[PDB]
Amino acid sequence: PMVRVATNLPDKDVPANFELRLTEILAESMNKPKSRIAVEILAGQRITHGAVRNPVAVIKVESIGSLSAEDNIRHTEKITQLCQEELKLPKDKVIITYFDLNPIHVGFNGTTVAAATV
Amino acid sequence: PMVRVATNLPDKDVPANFELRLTEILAESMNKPKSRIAVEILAGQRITHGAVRNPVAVIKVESIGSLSAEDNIRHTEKITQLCQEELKLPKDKVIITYFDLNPIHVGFNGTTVAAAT
Amino acid sequence: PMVRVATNLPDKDVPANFELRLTEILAESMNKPKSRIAVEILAGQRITHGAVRNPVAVIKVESIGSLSAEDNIRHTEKITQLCQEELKLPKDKVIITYFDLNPIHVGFNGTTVAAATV
């Protein structure tokens, strides 16, 4: 999984261990190994939501599978909870998009995932 | 809807009200509430186009619906016009990608849009 | 094609000609004109992979076509090679996602690509 978290909160408010907690949470929720999870944090961004600069997080999650309708309810609960605890965001200021990728559309280790598997 | 605007133009050239105008324009063009539109601006970025640093804006629009073939002509006209007026970019330096998302693939307010609707 | 390269390597380690080389390589591999290739570099980013801050590159490639199963093997090899030569990344620290866009979903020159073509 590849995760991008963008917030208008300053970097100061995103704790040093946030990426590590998000990695653990998604490893468990998605049944994926930590060694295949990347997290990018962009803080202090110019973001509006509803045309106001209230604190907000916009999150993108890409994965090959583990993104069923039921799975995404669980991932959303867990990610939203982490944002509430660590960033003090309200739930209506956490926006997540999930991209369920075909293995022919992911390169890793010098080839596609499709070309590396049975 | 979630909109990301990246440009190699300096932040100076992207006026303070750009996000607000883009919000209004897309609320009207897509028939969605302003309160459900997020805009991210990344200015002063390291971007090339044609392998040199000519001014460019690269825009991503994610939405559940309101992204039909006909809709996207309209959105493109309006977004491009705003970039012409406010950033002084030519229309061939405004590149937009639209992602039409299934409601099971969007989390908001602690659950998926599908599960809430 | 619209290409986004995010790395936790400092900007210093991403040479000034990286975008130019990537443009040429993808123009050739994807049979697309240089004048329709944009490359964004985000360097010095807060990125973890496997919950560590080891050097990593996360790359997104969007295009109308030129992203078949076979094409993507080739693109992955060439992009990974460039990252090895210029950024000194190991191949298991280069992650690429490919998005194959319908022409109705791309705005360019003030209209959609679909609306501008035969």
* Three-state secondary structure of chain C: CEEEEEECCCHHHCCCCHHHHHHHHHHHHHCCCHHHCEEEEECCCEEEECCECCCCEEEEEEECCCCCHHHHHHHHHHHHHHHHHHHCCCHHHEEEEEEECCHHHEEECCEEHHHHCC
What order of strands is seen across the sheet that includes strand A57-63?
B111-112, B106-108, A94-100, A57-63, A2-7, A38-42, C46-49
Distance from the Cα of residue C104 to its chain's centroid: 22
Instruction: State which amino acid sits at residue C114.
Output: A
**Contact, C95 vs C58, CB < 8 A?**
yes
Q: CA A34 to CA A31: how far, in whole Å?
A: 9
Mind telling me how many Å the CA of C19 is from chain A's nearest CA? Answer: 19
Domains and CATH numbers, chain A: 2-116 (3.30.429.10)
Residues in chain C, overall count: 118
**Minimal CA–CA distance to C23: which of C7, C39, C42, C41?**
C39
The three-class DSSP label of residue A18 is: helix
The alpha carbons of chain C give a radius of gyration, in whole angstroms, of: 15
Resolution (Å units): 2.1
Q: Say how many CB pairs under 8 Å bridge A and B.
A: 92
Closest B-chain CA to A55: B38
Q: Do C20 and B51 touch (CB under 8 A)?
A: yes
Structure-block tokens of residue C62: 């969007």
Interface of A with C in 41-80 (CB under 8 A): 41-43, 62
Q: Which residues of B touch C34 (CB under 8 A)?
A: 50-51
Say if CB C43 and CB C17 are below 8 A apart: no
Stated length of chain B: 117
Separation CA B8–CA B47 (nearest Å) = 6
- Residue C115: partners with Cβ closer than 8 Å, 6 or more residues away: B69, B73
